[PDB]
Amino acid sequence: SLETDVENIVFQFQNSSLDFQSSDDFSILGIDQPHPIVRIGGMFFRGTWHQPIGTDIVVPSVNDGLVLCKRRLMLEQIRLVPKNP
Amino acid sequence: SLKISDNEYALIEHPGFANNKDAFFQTLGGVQSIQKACQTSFQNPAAALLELNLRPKDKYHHPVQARVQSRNDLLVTIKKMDNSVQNVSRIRQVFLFRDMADFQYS
Ligand SMILES: [Hg+2]
Ligand SMILES: [Hg+2]
C-alpha cells in the first residue's frame, strides 16, 4: 500500500518549462522560513508555502508510495539585483 | 549542496481527504489501480489514464477522468531533525483532479 524520521515536500514551479535534470546542483536557504530561497543549477527561486485543498499521492517508478496532506512550496524564479550599482 | 537524484515519481492531485484510507484509495479504484496507473505513465506516457469516483453509492455521481500532464515538479525529502535535504527527485507526470470545474472550492 501507500504510507501517510524524514518528511516529503512537493516543489512546484511557476514556470513549468524550466528544465531541472538529475545531476543538477540543488541547495536551499531557509526551508523553515516563510520564503525559502532555492538554487538549482545557476537559477535562483523564492518559494511561498501553499496548502492545496485535497491530498497528494506520490507513487514511485522503478528506483534504486506516499500520501501527502501537508503544504507544498511554490517557486518563482528570481534575479539577484544589487540594491546599489 | 546536493545533486538531484535519478529517482522518479508520478503525482496524483486528489481533491478529497485520506481520513478513511481504504475509502480514499478506493476513489481511484484501489491501491492496485493506482499502481497500474503510475506504471502506464512510465511505460507508455501518452496512454496514461486514471478515473476518480468520490461518491460511489450515489447514482447522480459522474466519475471523472484526470487530466494528465508533466511539469517540472520535484519531490524533496528532508531529514526532520536538522531540516537537511536528504533527497531530491523528479515528478515526471501528474494526474490533475484538483481545479477541474467539478471540485472547485473557495
Ligand atoms: Hg494535512
Ligand atoms: Hg510507477
Numbering used by the authors:
A (entry chain B): 7 to 10, 14 to 73, 80 to 100
B (entry chain A): 3 to 108
Reproduce passages from the article.
Type 2 promoters contain two gene-internal DNA-binding elements named A- and B-box that are recognized by the general transcription factor IIIC (TFIIIC). We therefore structurally characterized the S. pombe TFIIIC Sfc1/Sfc7 subcomplex and present crystal structures of two structural modules. The N-terminal moiety of Sfc1 (Sfc1-NT) and subunit Sfc7 heterodimerize through a triple β-barrel fold most similar to the dimerization domains of general transcription factor TFIIF Rap30/Rap74, whereas the C-terminal DNA-binding domain of Sfc1 (Sfc1-DBD) comprises a winged-helix domain most similar to the winged-helix domain present in TFIIF Rap30 that is packed against a second domain with novel fold.
Well-diffracting crystals were obtained for a Sfc11-110(K48A,Q49A)/Sfc71-101 construct, where two non-conserved Sfc1 residues (K48 and Q49) were mutated into alanine following the suggestion of the surface entropy reduction prediction (SERp) server. The structure was solved at 2.4 Å by single-wavelength anomalous diffraction using para-chloro-mercuribenzene sulfonate as heavy-atom derivate. The interwoven structure suggests that the subunits fold co-operatively and need to be simultaneously expressed. The crystal structure also confirmed that the mutated residues K48 and Q49 lay at the surface of the Sfc1 dimerization domain and do not interfere with Sfc1–Sfc7 heterodimerization. According to program Dali, the structure shares the highest similarity with the TFIIF Rap30/Rap74 dimerization domains. Sfc1 and Sfc7 resemble Rap30 and Rap74, respectively (Z-score = 9.3, rmsd154CA = 4.7 Å). Despite the readily apparent structural similarity between Sfc1 and Rap30 and Sfc7 and Rap74, Sfc1 helices α1 to α3 and β-strands β3 and β4 replace Rap30 strands β3 and β4 (approximately residues 20–68), whereas the ‘arm domain’ of Rap74 is absent in Sfc7. The Sfc1-NT/Sfc7 dimerization domain can also be superimposed with the dimerization modules of Pol I subunits A49/A34.5 (Z-score = 7.7, rmsd142CA = 4.2 Å) and mouse RNase H2B/H2C (Z-score = 7.8, rmsd134CA = 3.7 Å).
